[PDB]
Design a protein around this ligand. Structure first.
Ligand SMILES: N[C@H](CCC(=O)N[C@@H](CSCCCCc1ccccc1)C(=O)NCC(=O)O)C(=O)O
Ligand SMILES: N[C@H](CCC(=O)N[C@@H](CSCCCCc1ccccc1)C(=O)NCC(=O)O)C(=O)O
Ligand SMILES: N[C@H](CCC(=O)N[C@@H](CSCCCCc1ccccc1)C(=O)NCC(=O)O)C(=O)O
Ligand code: NI
Lengths: 148, 148, 148
């Protein structure tokens, strides 16, 4: 047997996320051409700095997303986690587009991405609680018993 | 039984990648001493900014590499994925060395790293397609059948 | 059967790490308000630049930590890896607090975080060596045998 089936949606969402990050990167290179900024050096016009910063921020959050997606998907529920992941990634795409246009337009999709991510966290937390708390509670009761 | 055997090459390549990242970090600290830059603050001579930026970029791509390596290795083929990973990591080492010497010398190994990574993506995509597409196609046919 | 049991501590430490990263992020937003820095743009007073840089560095190391935690936990020993992970994360929290106050105060917890992480690396390396080296050594002997 294989456990590919138990994680395939997580893997698909993960790959989609990688692809999205790649898209962000190409958008950064394109802003580097458009606004004439050569590597190294990450300062230039406001629009470049916004696109660049949107990419940096997405990159910074991407491992957090992956970690929680997987923990939630394995410990809580695969489908829920994948859905939350899809919502998160879509929110991040909109974040990147907004930020690229204006700092303020990054905000609505930013909030959406954050809501989905904390939800992923909550599912992870609940799943882990479900795993550890019963055995822990039993062990505590046994020690009390004890009396006897 | 354990699934360590099914992922050991992925794990080895992963660890090698971590080690390589550590190497990049130590190279950055060494440039911080050589070109007299004290934390925080990441601006200084061109050579420092290049070494620093090479490290930043490698760091930024490292989770993307890990994600795709694992998805490709689990869904497509472990050995192929690990090989692509090795090529990628070697390419990144050369990227870092080039960039450290000159922005332009970062370019050839950069292209090599990108080719290997998209290959990892393609293997991931193919592996996932192989997982989902048959069941999906069957389900679609069944709905057509239906007639009857 | 499920392998949740074999990775639950790794998952818990991972989630704790994500939560800690989130904390760092909120601390950065709070410094953005306190020291009046609006996105994009990551320059401002020294204290902001230190908090920001502490967050950036933690973010940069977080995937390395995750990779090694998991490899060590799967290939060497789950409990040891999780413990090292806890020590690492605590060290990083102290790192962030120190850096936030003064660059120099980042140093002691920084060294602690590095010691724990290399230990994670060593466990990963030993676990992987244990997996590959016997089969490899046998294969080499068989080829020698050979004679005959
Ligand atoms: N923020 C960018 C860094 C990333 C980027 O936009 N481009 C990549 C290469 S983009 C090529 C295609 C996308 C890469 C990839 C990644 C993950 C999966 C698929 C494709 C890069 O290596 N830039 C720095 C350099 O030239 O050394 C920058 O610093 O300029
Ligand atoms: N780009 C660097 C950040 C990383 C770096 O080069 N050094 C590490 C520590 S390097 C020590 C050895 C390598 C760390 C490690 C990581 C992963 C696996 C093994 C070893 C660091 O913590 N720098 C910032 C700081 O002093 O607070 C910088 O901002 O100066
Ligand atoms: N270093 C920060 C980036 C991250 C940060 O501090 N805040 C997050 C949002 S913090 C909200 C709560 C924490 C997010 C989260 C992440 C992981 C798990 C749980 C919660 C952010 O999106 N900043 C940039 C922007 O406004 O576009 C900066 O560039 O200002
Ligand atoms: Ni199994």
């Amino acid at each position: 047997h294989h456990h590919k089936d138990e994680v395939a949606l997580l893997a698909a969402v993960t790959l989609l996320g990688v692809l999205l990050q790649a898209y962000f990167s190409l958008q950064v290179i394109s802003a580097r051409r458009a606004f004439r900024v050569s590597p190294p050096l990450t300062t230039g016009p406001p629009e470049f700095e916004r696109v660049y910063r949107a990419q940096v921020n997405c990159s910074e959050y991407f491992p957090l997303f992956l970690a929680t997606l997987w923990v939630a998907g394995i410990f809580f529920h695969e489908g829920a986690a994948a859905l939350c992941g899809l919502v998160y990634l879509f929110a991040r795409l909109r974040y990147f587009q907004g930020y690229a246009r204006s700092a303020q337009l990054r905000l609505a999709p930013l909030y959406a991405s954050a809501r989905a991510l904390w939800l992923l966290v909550a599912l992870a937390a609940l799943g882990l609680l479900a795993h550890f708390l019963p055995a822990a509670l039993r062990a505590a009761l046994l020690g009390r018993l004890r009396t006897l």
